[PDB]
């Protein structure tokens, strides 16, 4: 059942092994130099099908011919539609996120910065501090 990484294992592994993948981003496409455009602020005017389908499927489940997976799916879609407006309200109201919204920076400054010198993990205190010695 396993899909071998090296179908020609005795030969492929030697001169063309597989490297450790990189998951932060694709790394094969260009790097955007601009942030994403601010999506339109949402509202409850877009929960039509979500609400009505959730109602229908909940009724059909109370009957007993619907199931639970459909109920979960519909409820989660509707809840996402509501969380959209909740998060929009939070972002636009709370002040700590205004800087994050109007945050901008370039790869050149990223490479020129020098904060990477201080990314060293600390050291756990001594166990004698528990006894206060």
């Amino acid at each position: 059942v396993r899909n071998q990484r090296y179908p020609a294992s005795p030969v492929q592994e030697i001169f063309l092994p597989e490297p450790v993948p990189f998951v932060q981003f694709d790394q094969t496409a260009p790097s955007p130099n601009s942030p994403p455009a601010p999506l339109p602020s949402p509202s409850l005017s877009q929960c039509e099908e979500q609400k009505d389908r959730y109602r229908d499927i909940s009724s059909m489940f109370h009957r007993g011919v619907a199931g639970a997976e459909q109920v979960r799916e519909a409820y989660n879609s509707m809840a996402k539609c509501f969380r959209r407006v909740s998060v929009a309200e939070v972002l636009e109201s709370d002040p700590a996120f205004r800087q994050a919204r109007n945050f901008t920076m370039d790869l050149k400054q990223a490479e020129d910065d020098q904060r990477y010198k201080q990314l060293q993990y600390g050291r756990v205190p001594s166990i004698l501090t528990k006894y206060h010695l």
């Binding site: 996120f97 990223a110 490479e111 904060r115 990314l119 993990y121 600390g122 756990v124």
Partner: protein, 112 residues
Amino acid sequence: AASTIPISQWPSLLYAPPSSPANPAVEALPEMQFDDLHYPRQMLLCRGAGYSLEQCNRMAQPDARVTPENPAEKLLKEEAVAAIACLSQREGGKDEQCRYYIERMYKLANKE
């Protein structure tokens, strides 16, 4: 390529694990601690001093000798907040919608 690790090489496997897409801080693995004796020892010491159970429970505090905190949470604060906002707005960064912030953070942290 990835060959079996016998049972005799497990102690070295624990503090020098193989490379993965999500690696831990190998230089900090010897610093990960979580004391199961914290509260028992605290209570024992206080009761030996002469306090009561209620006084001991009021004076008790959580352990500070735990795994250290990531310095990124203090150095890359603004970039992390911006990335989290992007994720909250763009459904977790599906189809590469927070690549901007993620790549800025990656560059800042790695420097080639």
